[PDB]
Design a protein around this ligand. Structure first.
Ligand code: NAP
Ligand code: NAP
Ligand code: GRQ
Ligand code: GRQ
Ligand code: CL
Ligand code: CL
Ligand code: NA
Ligand code: NA
Ligand code: NA
Ligand code: NA
Lengths: 364, 364
């Protein structure tokens, strides 16, 4: 029997794993699923048949208490993180979180077969506060070239993971490195689509132009992204395919796009006039959206939306961090050469995730 | 039974179709193959079991004479063209060539099922003498948006093809739009790999640096390419899959690269010092390689190579035309959404095609 532990079940990838693992056509099914997060289970996560567990994995005692009874786990899908002001502190916090889970699950789960760890493109680009400031490898990024000579919590986590699997014979691992994720999760710390939807809804309410809050390279250079359901499929594939064992893999959609084009799509989905990149404006959502909580309460009330806090559904700092830089591309050759041929049409994916935020009444 | 007519059998895609169609694992096999070209069959095309036919398809009488007895043809793969000083003349010449073939094959082949026409990315970029001078659609290019408002022999050929298929019930068509092709054919009019190999061999012989004869955007912007075997697979797939009928499709490798990286690969394969793009040098192979015929004869003699004419094996004007422009990307979403999941790792493909030119003793 296959028994999953999703660490971060209400996250942008955790929520996609929660929906896909229990499906009839999922490989190695039928899957039993445990899902971990700290907050009470939100309404938009209820449409999935998972065993929800409240647990703060930064707390070793809580991790011991909540996870030690789950002796039937066969596959761990680790899809969470903690943000801090410096990468050094991110290494400390994130290493402890992964260590707390693995130290409990490995000795208590005799049928444990695989640990899948989600990291991301900052493995190649560097930490948030070094992006654009350091020499990186030239894109498109490939998986197995040397690491940057700077601390990175993904390196800390990979090294801990490799040491942890040594504790159990036959225990394999995988690493998954998405770019910017397009998905659904009103609780995610990094949700570009959800944040852009809230910005578009505020522009619509105020009768304002959907101005582009980003740089020229993000507007008309190439970009890519990683669909959350495709990432969930990629975690499942690496967890069950023996030819994918003990490898790190990028996971992006298999196409490229330009924000100059997707901006028209976003504007059309909210009935707003589409703006365009303007040289010298240096527009930031974190600044434009300051003090917009009463406007959000009004949009929620007038449109019969689910009651959300603006700071949870719109992570302005993250949208600015994405859109204020060029988007270096990555390579899907290693995944495809290992037999993973999943892809997504990114424009159709963007519309799908905008429409899911509308379907769950998060935005109008 | 499946019976192919390859129009341009010694070409860069024709030679790949000649090798792949007769294979045991090819869909709709066993294939009987007729291959057409004007010149006597060259030695490097003999390792394939095809029925070689000498025919100049610009001559209606020769086309009537050579093709009317081939009553068993079921699938036409059209992979040839004629170059002229203007696109207007290319429309005239290329339209007549395709018309001469189809006017004979359609009424004489009662079991004719499909016509596959190869065109290319200039459908979106414009003719050679307009590239960079006109407004095009923004990349990545997709297949079914309006044509440019300039003459293009691909438009002439598509329109002729659509009118021709009306002559026979159930006759379907496909169009295939590669980018720059990586393949093998010492007779091809557009062979980037073969030409770069000859340039590298001349640099090695002369003890010179492999300088980059192209622009900054070609050096460190993104590029893509189309592997000739993948294009041949794409022609076969569209010719046999009923869900691909009556559609135009791009065909590129599914990855991107930079010439800054591939230049190191090319240099390593010929044991030459690798040069780099130099601002202000504006290097052209058509100029650098002027008068190099005696040097080529010497390399051929010293390395026991097949006897080739420098102007046939190295199409300098074409390498300059490719490398002196940015490479706009295209999209493989329509092909993948129709079930074609073939891809190639472009770096491995480049090495494979360099090594095939070495294996047939075209270059050292
Ligand atoms: N999202 C993107 O665009 C993106 C892009 C590339 C890479 N990545 C990488 O993907 C990895 C996973 O992040 P994600 O974006 O998928 O996460 P996410 O959407 O922010 O979800 C995090 C999940 O973990 C839970 N969680 C947070 N802290 C926890 C703790 N201490 N104990 C238990 N549960 C906890 C959250 O719920 P509670 O708050 O209720 O606990 C939520 O369920 C990270 O390495 C991230 O950098 C993400
Ligand atoms: N090669 C590339 O990089 C590239 C890239 C994108 C698109 N394309 C497009 O692909 C299409 C096909 O070109 P290709 O590059 O595959 O061709 P190619 O490699 O130049 O081969 C042409 C073939 O057709 C034969 N041929 C030429 N004129 C003929 C005639 N009048 N009658 C009979 N046979 C004739 C040639 O042999 P003989 O000379 O012995 O007759 C050769 O076998 C064109 O539309 C081209 O623009 C090519
Ligand atoms: C830190 C800055 C200026 C940009 C970050 C780009 C990005 C969204 C990376 C990983 O998430
Ligand atoms: C005409 C110029 C300057 C570049 C042509 C680029 C290219 C190789 C297109 C199609 O074959
Ligand atoms: Cl990341
Ligand atoms: Cl072309
Ligand atoms: Na686009
Ligand atoms: Na999707
Ligand atoms: Na490259
Ligand atoms: Na190949």
């Amino acid at each position: 029997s296959s028994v999953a532990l999703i660490v971060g079940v209400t996250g942008i990838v955790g929520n996609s794993l929660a929906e896909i693992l229990p499906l009839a056509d999922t490989p190695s099914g039928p899957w039993k699923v445990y899902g971990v997060a700290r907050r009470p289970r939100p309404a938009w996560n209820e449409d999935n048949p998972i065993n929800y567990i409240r647990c703060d994995i930064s707390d070793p005692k809580d991790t011991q208490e909540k996870l030690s009874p789950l002796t039937d786990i066969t596959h761990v899908f680790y899809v969470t993180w903690a943000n801090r002001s410096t990468e050094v502190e991110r290494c400390e916090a994130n290493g402890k979180m992964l260590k707390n889970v693995l130290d409990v699950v490995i000795p208590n789960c005799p049928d444990l077969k695989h640990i899948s760890l989600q990291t991301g493109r900052k493995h190649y680009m560097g930490p948030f506060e070094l992006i654009g400031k350091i020499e990186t490898h030239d894109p498109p990024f490939t998986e197995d070239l040397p690491r940057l000579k700077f601390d990175n919590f993904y390196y800390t986590q990979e090294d801990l993971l490799f040491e942890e699997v040594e504790k159990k014979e036959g225990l394999t691992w995988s690493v998954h490195r998405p770019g910017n994720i397009f998905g659904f999760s009103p609780y995610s710390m990094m949700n570009l689509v959800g944040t852009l939807c809230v910005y578009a809804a505020i522009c619509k309410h105020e009768g304002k132009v959907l101005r582009f809050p980003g740089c020229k390279a993000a507007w008309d250079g190439y970009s890519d992204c990683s669909d959350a359901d495709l990432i969930a499929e990629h975690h499942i594939w690496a967890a069950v395919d023996p030819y994918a064992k003990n490898e790190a893999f990028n996971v992006s959609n298999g196409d490229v796009f330009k924000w100059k084009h997707f901006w028209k799509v976003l504007a059309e989905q909210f009935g707003v006039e589409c703006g365009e990149y303007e040289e010298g404006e240096n527009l930031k959502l974190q600044d434009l959206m300051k003090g917009k909580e009463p406007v959000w309460e009004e949009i929620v009330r007038e449109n019969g939306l689910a009651s959300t806090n603006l700071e949870d559904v719109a992570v302005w700092w993250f949208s600015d961090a994405v859109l204020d830089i060029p988007c270096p591309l990555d390579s899907m050759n290693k995944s495809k050469e290992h037999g993973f041929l999943g892809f997504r049409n990114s424009k159709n994916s963007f519309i799908s995730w905008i429409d899911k935020a509308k379907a769950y009444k998060i935005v109008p």
